[PDB]
Structure formats: structure tokens, C-alpha cells
Design a protein around this ligand. Sequence first.
Ligand SMILES: CC(C)CN(C[C@@H](O)[C@H](Cc1ccccc1)NC(=O)O[C@H]1CCOC1)S(=O)(=O)c1ccc(N)cc1
Ligand SMILES: CC(C)CN(C[C@@H](O)[C@H](Cc1ccccc1)NC(=O)O[C@H]1CCOC1)S(=O)(=O)c1ccc(N)cc1
Lengths: 99, 99
Amino acid sequence: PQITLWKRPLVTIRIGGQLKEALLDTGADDTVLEEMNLPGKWKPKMIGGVGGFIKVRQYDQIPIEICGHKVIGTVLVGPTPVNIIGRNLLTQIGCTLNF
Amino acid sequence: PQITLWKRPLVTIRIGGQLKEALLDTGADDTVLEEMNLPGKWKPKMIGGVGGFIKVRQYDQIPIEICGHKVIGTVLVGPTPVNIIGRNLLTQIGCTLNF
Ligand SMILES: CC(C)CN(C[C@@H](O)[C@H](Cc1ccccc1)NC(=O)O[C@H]1CCOC1)S(=O)(=O)c1ccc(N)cc1
Ligand SMILES: CC(C)CN(C[C@@H](O)[C@H](Cc1ccccc1)NC(=O)O[C@H]1CCOC1)S(=O)(=O)c1ccc(N)cc1
């Protein structure tokens, strides 16, 4: 697809068997999702942005389906106010910025 | 250009007579720059990000040049950890996400 930026670049994803809406975010180094349960091992990490930092759980090698593109990689989970697909998974779908 | 996302999509912008490095940020509604002594009328506002809210100065109708593309719009100035080009100006340079 080609996604224009007049509106937020929201897409449907599936993770852990569940469908969610998420922002395609080129400003995010790594994918971070709103508080949820995910199976498997995780480790604590900090991420920072506008407003400061939050503590998250880092899960590695997690399958995610993004608009029918299957990726597998790092998913952070914590108190972000929005679900965010970051560069780590955008590269896996072959996403580029064009102008 | 067609910009891959292996690394942060940093570009050079020209604003208020200064050359600055900024992040092309599809997850950002607004453009927010690190604190700087920009002349002009502004209004105080708050914006929210991952970690909470910050107070910013809102400057309207500011000329900005992004990768040779000359645009005009709202620029927020405040304690962001990185200069961010958000959708208000990404639409003006004709930027799209493609995968
Ligand atoms: C600030 C950049 C450098 C990093 N953020 C990504 C940005 O797109 C961020 C995404 C977001 C949108 C809406 C609500 C909350 C967050 N938008 C953002 O703050 O919009 C503000 C600034 C202007 O307009 C409004 S991040 O969320 O902090 C972040 C940091 C690290 C990781 N691994 C993942 C996410
Ligand atoms: C608002 C914060 C940054 C604290 N201010 C410091 C001020 O220099 C502040 C710095 C600033 C510059 C540019 C963007 C944002 C903030 N200038 C300012 O123009 O900010 C307006 C814009 C949006 O909201 C308030 S403070 O309240 O004045 C103050 C002063 C002394 C003490 N001890 C405590 C607080």
C-alpha cells in the first residue's frame, strides 16, 4: 500500500492471536504496544520520548501480522497511550518513506 | 528520495536561520523542535507523547525548509529530546509511507 499522512497512519495488526489497531511510526526505534499479555520470556527496558520515559517489557522474536505482512521481532509492552509499530518491524515489511 | 528505515530517518532542516537535524516522524501529529530563541508571536500549549505532557510554544505560519522542500506551517518549540517533523509538514513535502 501507499499511505498518505493527512490522517494518522493506522493499520490493523494481529499479535498473540488478537487484532489491534496500530500506528505506523517512523519516529519509533522499536514497536511498543499498550499493556497486554503476551506469552514468553521478557526483560525490562526503558524507552523515552516526548513527555519523558516509560518502563516496558521487551519480548524478542514475536510474530506480528501487519496488514497481511508477517514479521517476527521485538515487541515492547507498556503504558504507551497508543499502539506503535516502530522501525524494527517497518523494515521487516519493506516500508520506506518517499517524497 | 526513497528512504529506508534501518536507521533513524534524520534530515537537515532550515528554520529560523538555523540548520538542524530532525527526525521524519509519521507517528507525530505535530512538528516539535528543541528549545531555541525563535522570534515571532507564539501561544503556550501542551502536547502529549509516550511519557506524558510537555509545555510548548506554538508558532504559526513559520517557513521551514526540509531537504530542499520549502514549506510553511505550525512549529512547536519545547523540551523535546529530538527535533521532530510531524505530519503537518510531512504532508506538505508530499511524504508517503510505502510497503
Ligand atoms: C518522540 C519520538 C522520538 C519517539 N516516539 C515516537 C513518536 O512518533 C510519538 C508516538 C506517539 C504518538 C501518540 C502518543 C504517544 C506516542 N509521537 C509523539 O510524541 O507525538 C507528539 C510529538 C509531536 O506530535 C505529538 S515515542 O513514542 O516516544 C517512542 C520512543 C521509543 C520507542 N521505541 C517507541 C516510541
Ligand atoms: C514552563 C516551564 C518550561 C518552566 N518555565 C520556564 C520558562 O523559561 C519557559 C521555558 C520554555 C521555553 C520554550 C518552550 C517551553 C518552555 N519559558 C516559556 O516561554 O515557556 C512557556 C511556553 C509554554 O509554557 C510556558 S517557568 O514556568 O517560567 C518557570 C520559571 C522558573 C521556575 N523556577 C519554574 C518555572
